[PDB]
Design a protein around this ligand. Structure first.
Ligand code: HEM
Ligand code: HEM
Ligand SMILES: Cc1cc(N)nc(C[C@@H]2CNC[C@@H]2OCCCCCc2cccc(F)c2)c1
Ligand SMILES: Cc1cc(N)nc(C[C@@H]2CNC[C@@H]2OCCCCCc2cccc(F)c2)c1
Ligand SMILES: C[C@H](O)[C@H](O)[C@H]1CNc2nc(N)[nH]c(=O)c2N1
Ligand SMILES: C[C@H](O)[C@H](O)[C@H]1CNc2nc(N)[nH]c(=O)c2N1
Ligand SMILES: [Zn+2]
Lengths: 407, 411
């Protein structure tokens, strides 16, 4: 019932109690582990509300006060009458920060409490959503001293009045299927790059075309907008020692900003809540560039290094992978955009576990996601036992909207 | 019921029904995943059911489920359990059993090789000298002058658990570690506590960087005894790099035969507490783990210094760079000396092909993702993108507490 986690490199043992608060279900049974699967009424709403406000008033050391009891009644009455309720700003900010704090797949949660929250519950139109989003992007980008931020559009009501940002991220490159059969640009975006063209986008058809935002307000048909180019900070990719690297013509964007998730706070569902921080180098260099069904450039790079590619045992793939990732970090640093390397990032996360275990009695964590996709065992998170469990408030996946919104 | 696993790189979807034959528990519940936790005298009552399940399985594999020969064998085991409390496996069931325990090993990336396993039946062994001789033979047969062959040696099952056969070493071949008065360590840090036991027991430690530990062997619940493996039986590879000539001057070498001796083999309810097995190495077990863990040989600094990497900031990726060259050296040295080794690209590819064929013929393949994905270059090997379902089948290999914590000393 009280569970231990051992770090096998330091022998440090931490005891977890926070999991007993856990509410939702993981997918695992004690017959099957599902830890490596990517996706495994008014009646309900009040319990949910009460649990949230309970932890809120606990957090500001007012558990059991007049303020607390009063608020609990205020909400109870509001649900009774309206079938939903509205969050105070103070609760919204707390809710959002905690959804991040609770993201068991996020290695960067040591920053959770510095989240700038932009309240956009007064939004009503796609143009309104566009203006909110450009302000988010500009605030977040900060000319390269990147700043974490979330923007929260209005909560679900009947579920046919959804706000949704259709893009998966606010900034992404276009992917085009070719007569060739091969793929130009980002193949993970092919479908969407064609939902845009299908709604009127004039595609440049290049390697690195920044996609239009495609915004849905109040459950209406969605609309295209080009993010002002001057708001999209990009980094030319060069190597600190390899002259020919430049010539690959590689760039990436500075702002990672997840826009397709659903934020739940105290039973309320915020289906458009794009949030953003900054990159861990590997997310670009390992996955974006080298992944088979992504940009997949390893072959072309190994060649320029003139490595022996006749046998896997030369470790040429590995060799090239390191260089590509050296060059992502070097480029971002030289162009002064915030970026963290996986050594630094896993090292802070360890520190953040220590803190969460002593400050909160635990920290939910998904080992499969926390360990970098390169050099696992040389980052301290590899040797760290983690417990995974679902706390609220949370970010959750939700169906892609083109499959749902009846056009 | 039916459960689907998706490969996110190929979009191939597989359906598992085999997980329905799991009855042992995982450690997880619907409220917690314990999937990254290292570790999440038996009576008559529970024994015939385990025996029965095992023998229904064995007889299905040979297309004789329901046969007179199946029914007679159940009767026979039945009778033998109630008058003796235990039972004995036939040769054919022991072999079938040992193979299946490997096959059910969800943590093993090497399982494409499961049906090619040399089983040595050492259930007539009674003494430690007898254990030594059996283990020597296995080490010679498995080494095979560099052309490694998989093998397992199986000593007598547990009886009252007061009479255990144990191999006290965690692997048949390993290097000593010595903690110095100044706080530093010579040799392998993982091996210190064990080296201390060996020394205490009579072993004359040469006190070098690569001293092959003596075998410490328990027969029939007796005190364990020291033995030295004949050095000519211990195939070792000096580590050099194909381009970096300063590399040999680091003075490194590794043994060729990876051989786990500390696990417990369960077959049909019976517990074989000494069942050393061996295969051949995936390079990263030495290059990444053995050399490059901070808690192991930790030669990253020494290798990065020689390579002239910028070591002042971790974002130079000096560590990642050194780690790759060490792994280059490890596969180079082994291949140059004609000792079987596999790189992690070839090993993970084969496993994906094993895994798929297992879903097709067997209806499943339990697999632990945390363990199967290699400890360098994770996402460029196809297992990273493969969804996996982990569950416990028997027969199986299980961890067991170190015998120095449990053993009742005699004198
Ligand atoms: C401050 C910089 C941040 C870093 C370096 C970071 C790190 C990461 C990384 C490396 C991943 C894995 C992505 C993948 O491999 O697909 C991830 C996932 C995630 N992060 Fe962060 N994070 C940061 C900020 C944030 C913020 C501001 C939030 C929200 C407030 C957040 C919430 C999440 C969530 C929900 C996931 C899982 C997404 C999914 O399931 O696909 N992170 N994080
Ligand atoms: C054919 C050569 C083999 C290769 C390349 C191979 C590969 C591996 C590797 C890399 C590991 C992980 C070790 C670690 O990370 O510490 C492993 C684990 C394991 N393998 Fe193999 N394996 C082989 C043969 C065998 C054999 C012959 C058996 C038994 C018959 C076996 C059973 C197991 C078991 C039980 C584990 C988990 C060990 C643990 O939980 O500590 N393997 N395999
Ligand atoms: C705020 C933030 C910062 C940061 N460094 N990374 C992140 C999350 C990262 C950004 N790159 C990829 C990831 O976004 C989530 C990607 C979606 C994976 C889940 C998913 C669900 C359905 C179908 C799919 F193909 C994938 C978020
Ligand atoms: C037969 C065989 C071949 C091969 N290539 N690899 C293996 C397994 C590897 C070989 N070297 C040691 C390793 O097994 C044990 C090493 C780490 C296990 C530690 C450990 C601690 C607690 C519970 C466990 F289940 C395991 C075994
Ligand atoms: C099958 C497995 O669950 C899947 O590939 C995961 C593995 N680990 C990951 N880890 C991170 N950080 N991001 C991912 O997209 C994935 N994919
Ligand atoms: C904490 C974690 O589960 C543990 O360190 C595991 C991680 N994955 C591993 N994977 C392999 N192949 N071998 C190991 O020893 C480990 N260690
Ligand atoms: Zn689990």
């Amino acid at each position: 019932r009280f569970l231990k986690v051992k770090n096998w490199e330091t022998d440090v043992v931490l005891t977890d109690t926070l999991h007993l608060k856990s509410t939702l279900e993981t997918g695992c049974t004690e017959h099957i582990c599902m830890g490596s699967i990517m996706l495994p009424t008014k009646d309900q709403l009040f319990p949910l509300a009460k649990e949230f406000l309970d932890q809120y008033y606990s957090s500001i050391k007012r558990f059991g006060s007049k303020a607390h009891m009063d608020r609990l009644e205020e909400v109870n009455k509001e649900i009774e009458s309206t079938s939903t309720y509205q969050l105070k700003d103070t609760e919204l900010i707390y809710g959002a920060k905690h959804a991040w704090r609770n993201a068991s797949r996020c290695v960067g949660r040591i920053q959770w409490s510095k989240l700038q929250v932009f309240d956009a519950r007064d939004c009503t139109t796609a143009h309104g959503m566009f203006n909110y989003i450009c302000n988010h992007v500009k605030y977040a980008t900060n000319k390269g001293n990147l700043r974490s931020a979330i923007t929260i559009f209005p909560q679900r009501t009947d579920g046919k009045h959804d706000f949704r940002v259709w893009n998966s991220q606010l900034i992404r490159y276009a992917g085009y299927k070719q007569p060739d059969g091969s793929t130009l640009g980002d193949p993970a975006n092919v479908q969407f790059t064609e939902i845009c063209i299908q709604q009127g986008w004039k595609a440049p058809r290049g390697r690195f075309d920044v996609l239009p935002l495609l915004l849905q307000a109040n459950g209406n048909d969605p609309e295209l907008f080009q993010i002002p180019p001057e708001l999209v900070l990009e980094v030319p990719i060069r190597h600190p020692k390899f002259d020919w690297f430049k010539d690959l013509g590689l760039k990436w964007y500075g702002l990672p900003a997840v826009s397709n998730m659903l934020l739940e706070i105290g039973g309320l569902e915020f289906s458009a809540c794009p949030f953003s921080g900054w990159y861990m180098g590997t997310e670009i260099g390992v996955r974006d560039y080298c992944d088979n069904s992504r940009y997949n450039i390893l072959e072309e790079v190994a060649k320029k290094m003139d490595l022996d590619m006749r046998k896997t045992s030369s470790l040429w793939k590995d060799q090239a992978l390191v260089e590509i990732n050296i060059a992502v970090l070097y480029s971002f640093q030289s162009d002064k955009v915030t970026i963290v390397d996986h050594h630094s990032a896993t090292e802070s996360f360890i520190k953040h576990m220590e803190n969460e275990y002593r400050c909160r009695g635990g920290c939910p964590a998904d080992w499969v996601w926390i360990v970098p996709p390169m050099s696992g065992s040389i980052t301290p998170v590899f040797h760290q036992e983690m417990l995974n469990y679902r706390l609220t408030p949370s970010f959750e996946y939700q169906p892609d909207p083109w499959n749902t919104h009846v056009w």
